[PDB]
Design a protein around this ligand. Structure first.
Ligand code: GI2
Length: 436
């Protein structure tokens, strides 16, 4: 058997724009994912978040599903433009009401809320003023965060400033594949820097406003292995994984190979902001999905396709990656607490004639990764919790509804939820507090 520590937090994770639908209900402002998904060519099949999982109406049902599965923590995000329709200034009480009902319900049912403040749905009104490219976002973000703390901080005690600021900056502003759909490397790195400053401003406000809770930040991570016998792997780690943000947070500068590549793209006096950026955080969230073979190639790095099982995303399944990144984060920055805030897989799920979804591929994926996280705990990593991405099949960004990551299947024509075998399997893992 592989049992986890007593009080280990088994969770599932979602994001507002991916599940909610009704993006314009009850006075909500438009978000950049509203405007991006409504722009032709940006998202597969013209898919948008207009309806998604209709969680905006079905939230109680979905929470009752979390409850009945015995899952102990729910990670979800708040839509900034539901709360502040223009991003700053006016507060929308109906937006607050929506999340208040979700929060109270979870608490009533003994489920621990983990709130992601920003999971990519920036108010459109602020994108007009430059979004993450504008230094003033540190103030906008801090004022938004202050509102959340004041309203919910009596009940929510676990907070995440940013989901994957690497993706926000690079995929949103260099690759142009995500909202706001830009391709400018100087904008992208100014977004990197500004995300840090906004995160640190929000942590600071948190200490003034919520004196009994905890706050952290979430990073995407890949397990990069070299194609031969390598500095390219060092670069990929420092650029794509937690060091881009943790070196500033813990050591007060960007990682060495990030500076070699991107110094010219960062603001000229960026070190002026580093001491503020070092604001103390309580935990690191790591998201992990995939491993990559990497070689130097005249960013001077390209990927090598390997055999190896892949998911529907074409992501190579490499379970030892989650152990590696867990070990490496302790070794490099030794944060006091770590959570796996997302781990999961997209497979081509089908409802069998028996009415069930027989996702053995997903069970195998989760089991392998849960086992590798168990190992990291035996070897001393302060891992406090683990979150499956995702509770539900949902809007998978530029892929639309075509990629299914849920442990619960959503039939989009009816909004029917069907617990997949992986969801039942995970329930038993949570009940048993580990594997066997
Ligand atoms: C480059 O590293 C990554 O993008 C890892 C990653 C995967 N995922 C996320 N990040 C987001 O937090 C979720 O909103 C997605 O639905 C989920 C699945 O694609």
């Amino acid at each position: 058997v592989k049992k986890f520590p007593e009080g280990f937090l088994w969770g599932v994770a979602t994001a507002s724009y991916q599940i909610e639908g009704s993006p314009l209900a009850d006075g909500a402002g438009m978000s950049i994912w509203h405007t991006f998904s409504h722009t032709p060519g940006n998202v597969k099949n013209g898919d948008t978040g207009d309806v998604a999982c209709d969680h905006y109406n079905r939230w109680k049902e979905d929470i009752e599903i979390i409850e009945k599965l015995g899952v102990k923590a729910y990670r979800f995000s708040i839509s900034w433009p539901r709360i502040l329709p223009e991003g700053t200034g006016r507060v929308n009480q109906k937006g607050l009401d929506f999340y208040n009902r979700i929060i109270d319900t979870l608490l009533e049912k003994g489920i621990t809320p983990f709130v992601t403040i920003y999971h990519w749905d920036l108010p459109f009104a602020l994108q007009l003023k430059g979004g993450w490219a504008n230094r003033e976002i540190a103030d906008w973000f801090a004022e938004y965060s202050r509102v959340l703390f004041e309203n919910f901080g009596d009940r929510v005690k676990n907070w995440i400033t940013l989901n994957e600021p690497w993706v926000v900056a690079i995929v949103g502003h260099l690759y142009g594949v995500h909202a706001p759909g830009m391709r400018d490397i100087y904008v992208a790195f100014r977004a990197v820097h500004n995300l840090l400053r906004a995160h640190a401003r929000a942590v600071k406000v948190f200490r003034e406003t919520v004196k009994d809770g905890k706050i952290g930040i979430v990073f995407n991570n890949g397990y990069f292995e070299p194609a031969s016998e390598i500095r390219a792997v060092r670069f990929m780690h420092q650029f794509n994984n937690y060091p881009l943000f943790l070196n500033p947070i813990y050591r007060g500068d960007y990682p060495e190979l990030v500076l070699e590549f991107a110094r010219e793209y960062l603001p000229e006096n960026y070190k002026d902001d580093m001491s503020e950026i070092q604001e103390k955080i309580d935990f690191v969230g790591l998201n992990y999905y995939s491993g990559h073979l990497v070689k130097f190639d005249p960013a001077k790095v390209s990927f090598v396709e390997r055999d190896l099982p892949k998911t529907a995303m074409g992501w190579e399944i490499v379970p030892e990656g989650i152990y590696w990144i867990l070990k490496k984060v302790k070794e490099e920055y030794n944060p006091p607490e770590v959570y796996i805030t997302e781990n999961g897989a997209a497979f081509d799920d089908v409802v069998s004639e028996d009415g069930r979804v027989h996702d053995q591929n997903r069970i195998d994926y989760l089991k392998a990764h849960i086992g590798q996280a168990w190992k990291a705990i035996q070897e001393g990593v302060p891992l406090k919790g683990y979150f499956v991405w995702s509770l539900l099949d949902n809007f998978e960004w530029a892929e639309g509804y075509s990629k299914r990551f849920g442990i619960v299947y959503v039939d989009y024509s009816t909004q029917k939820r069907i617990v997949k075998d992986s969801g039942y399997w995970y329930s038993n893992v949570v009940k048993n507090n580990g594997l066997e």
